[PDB]
Design a protein around this ligand. Structure first.
Ligand SMILES: *[C@@H]1O[C@H](CO)[C@@H](O)[C@H](O)[C@H]1NC(C)=O
Ligand SMILES: [Pt+2]
Ligand SMILES: [Pt+2]
Ligand SMILES: [Pt+2]
Length: 180
């Protein structure tokens, strides 16, 4: 078994539906391994953090798993994970299917997303249906991803639940914590 191999952690001012999940490299799996491609997409205002991993994983169930962790209005978090058992099967290139990333009471909320800590988080007018401000940090380990992501923005979600308690995202483990 051979798998597309690549690792990418970026914050884009450009939409997710122009991200190219290109991988040049391939790698050889131990026997009984799977191919995985896993991506976590976090949009705050006009910026999108994209944490993406492709390679062999020694064990797992063949499955495609799409999770809409947070839906509009406001902060949007989607993950896609494909665990597949044919050589080169982890070949996804486009995120165009995730149109959540293509777009009375007004909330103004500090807005940012950053690898590490946000340089700045200006308070911006929130999309209609927002009821509160979110501030959190995601500590991510697994699949060769090691990062903290700071996230502030607009939401109608209750509590510290940007990930909706779905903390396993293919081989990544995402620990979500908020200020108080
Ligand atoms: C915003 O939300 C409310 C509640 O659904 C709606 O009635 C109101 O007209 C909306 N405001 C705008 C600017 O569309
Ligand atoms: Pt392996
Ligand atoms: Pt699909
Ligand atoms: Pt937002």
């Amino acid at each position: 078994l051979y798998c597309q191999k690549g690792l990418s952690m970026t914050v884009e001012a450009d939409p997710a539906n122009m991200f190219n999940w290109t991988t040049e490299e391939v790698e050889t799996c131990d026997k009984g391994a799977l191919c995985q491609e896993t991506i976590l997409i976090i949009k705050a205002g006009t910026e999108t953090a994209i944490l993406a991993t492709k390679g062999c994983i020694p064990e797992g169930e063949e499955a495609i798993t799409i999770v809409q962790h947070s839906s509009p209005p406001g902060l949007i978090v989607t993950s896609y994970s494909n665990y597949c058992e044919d050589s080169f099967c982890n070949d996804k290139d486009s995120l165009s299917q995730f149109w959540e990333f293509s777009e009375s009471t007004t909330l103004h909320c500090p807005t940012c997303v950053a690898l590490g800590t946000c340089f700045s988080a200006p308070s911006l007018p929130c999309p209609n249906g927002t009821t509160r401000c979110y501030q959190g940090k995601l500590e991510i380990t697994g699949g060769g991803i090691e990062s903290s992501v700071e996230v502030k923005g607009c939401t109608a979600m209750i509590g510290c639940r940007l990930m909706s308690g779905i903390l396993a995202v293919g081989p990544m483990f995402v620990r979500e914590a908020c200020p108080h």
